[PDB]
Amino acid sequence: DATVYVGGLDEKVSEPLLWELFLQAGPVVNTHMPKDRVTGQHQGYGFVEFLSEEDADYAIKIMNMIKLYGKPIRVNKA
Amino acid sequence: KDPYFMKNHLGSYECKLCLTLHNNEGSYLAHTQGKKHQTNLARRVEVKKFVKIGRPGYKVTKQRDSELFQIDYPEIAEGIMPRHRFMSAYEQRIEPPDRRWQYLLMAAEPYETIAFKVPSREIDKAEGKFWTHWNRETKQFFLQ
Amino acid sequence: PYWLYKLHGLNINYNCEICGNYTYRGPKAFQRHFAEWRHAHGMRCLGIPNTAHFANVTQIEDAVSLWAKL
Amino acid sequence: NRFTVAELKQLVARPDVVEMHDVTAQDPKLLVHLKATRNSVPVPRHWCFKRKYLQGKRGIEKPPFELPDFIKRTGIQEMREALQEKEEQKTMKSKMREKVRPKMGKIDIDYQKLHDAFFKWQTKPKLTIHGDLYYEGKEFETRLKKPGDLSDELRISLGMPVGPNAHKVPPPWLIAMQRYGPPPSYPNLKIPGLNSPIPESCSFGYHA
RNA sequence: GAUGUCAUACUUAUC
């Protein structure tokens, strides 16, 4: 309920960059970025877990027009 | 040409495939032959510019229906149907003030676009495949 | 290999009663999975916040007593 | 005899410093009191490892040396690199002929410039506190941000030029913040154009 | 990660 899935991000984006992008709408408690350890590249998706479900829903509904490196980033509930 | 043997910052040799160290150069060449090294090796624009624009005079007839506009266009002699699209009034050639409405414009290739402003928010659908029709036998275009 | 599983402490059965009595094949693996998303989602059902005091907590009754004592 | 971690966490006033290995020691209460002290330093994490804290950075690339500005502002590094480049091209006969009749004046830069760099141009290094210990991954963990402020890298990646005018300098997610309202996780957050003046608060955010 | 034979290199102003 408090975890939102962010997709549509490029491989060049980093986890402190994603944390600084997500902190503009609310403090995120944790940020998990699944990446392959064999190649060292991200999969283009991440999970941001906030402190509450209402703040996560507000961050998912307020980040519907975010563009990173020319690619639109989508936020969904998970 | 071994892609695994590299030089460290201490003047030694390092095998990143097996992650081994060698002090002298004579031990790095003897480390390629062995069991662990063999195990590590086995484990690892044109249509827009050519469009003619003479801008003829269009003939649109609107009618308030209840449950639709009819645009009379000449013969285009092509299979390309005229397309309708709803846009905003924020983009213009001179940008007039107090422009906060929407306009549905129908455009064709040999003819100019005809635009009608809609003050309402949503009263119909401006989709092309849903509620539009173009009779090529009589060359009659309609959209509701 | 058996030597890499015997030297690193692998192939050792450990029971975690917090996340539905799950199984863990290592003490270091269980310590790494304690500060993870699965253990946090298991602890959020009981109402305990994700803090540093419940790192070595395994039983649900001991975690509930540690949450009620603070 | 040896109690579990739950009794050691409930008996001690600070259960955050209690570990799983401290329950099987000879004094759990004394270890819990010493680990939760005011100025105590924790034990390093390499005491339970098996690589002796020196076998992790085997194949990792590392720079040879990081020279400071006071040492690089004297012109000795370029002269040393030129001498190393000139000495690497000499053969054994050129090295043996230079030992009987050497050529004096190798660089001969200055004599008071090094004293001025070591006494007048002395710069203090970036030290640390005594509690901040060192580990194997401490040199690579540099990720350890504020609401209402954006860095240059995030502004270059998102394509948002930071300006004093609040027309386009806020991100385009501010329209959703104006339609839905302020974020519930930060009641004291003030954004220009909604709850703050636009020419006054030119930092695109204020935590008051 | 350990074992037991061989080789290389390093340290304590050792002689």
DSSP A22-75: HTTTS-EEEEE--EETTTTEE-SEEEEEESSHHHHHHHHHH-TTEEETTEEEEE
Count the neighbouring beta carbons within 10 Å of the beta carbon of residue D176: 16
Contact flag C37-A29 (C-beta cutoff 8 Å): no
For residue D59, CA distances in Å to A39, A43, A54, B47, D200 come to 16, 26, 46, 56, 53
The minimal CB distance from A61 to the residues D153, D157, D176 is found for D176
Residues of D with CB under 8 A from a CB of A: 143, 145-148, 150-151, 153-154, 157-159, 171-173, 175-177, 180, 183-186, 205
What are B84's strand-pairing partners? B106
- Top residue of A5, A30, A31 to mutate, by most chain C CBs within 10 Å, is A30
Contact flag D6-C62 (C-beta cutoff 8 Å): yes
Q: After which residues is chain B broken (C to N over 2.5 A)?
A: 44, 67
Contact predicate C54/C66, CB 8 Å: yes
B112 touches chain D (CB under 8 A): no
For residue B116, CA distances in Å to B19, B54, B134, D43 come to 72, 20, 18, 77
User: How many angstroms is the resolution?
Assistant: 5.8
CA atoms within 13 A on the CB side of B89: 13
For residue A33, CA distances in Å to A16, A44, B84 come to 11, 8, 43
Burial of D169 (0-12, 13-18, 19+ CB in 10 A): buried
A12 secondary structure, DSSP code: T
B30 nearest nt, CA–C1': E7
> Using CA atoms, how far apart are residues D181 and A55, in angstroms rounded to an integer?
12
Can you give the three-state secondary structure of chain D, one letter per residue? CCCCHHHHHHHCCCHHHCCCCHHHCCCHHHHHHHHCCCCCCCCCHHHCCCCCCCCCCCCCCCCCCCCCHHHHCCCHHHHHHHHHHHHCCCCHHHHHHCCCCCCCCCCCCCCCHHHHHHHCCCCCCCCCCCCCCCCCCCCCCCCCCCCCCCCHHHHHHHCCCCCCCCCCCCCCCHHHHHHHCCCCCCCCEECECCCECCCCCCCCCEEC
Experimental method: cryo-EM
> Closest residue to E2 by CA to C1' distance?
C7
D32 touches chain C (CB under 8 A): no
D10 touches chain C (CB under 8 A): yes
Contact predicate B90/B65, CB 8 Å: no
Measured in degrees and rounded to the nearest 5, phi and psi for residue B135 equal -80, 110
For residue D58, CA distances in Å to B7, B29, D136, D168, D201 come to 11, 18, 12, 49, 51
C42 secondary structure, DSSP code: H
Q: Protein footprint on strand E: which nucleotides are under 7 Å from a CB?
A: 1-2, 7-9
Distance D51 CA to E4 C1' (A): 21
Structure tokens at D62: 């590392």
Residue D178, sorted as left (phi over 0), alpha (psi -120 to 50) or beta, turns out to be alpha
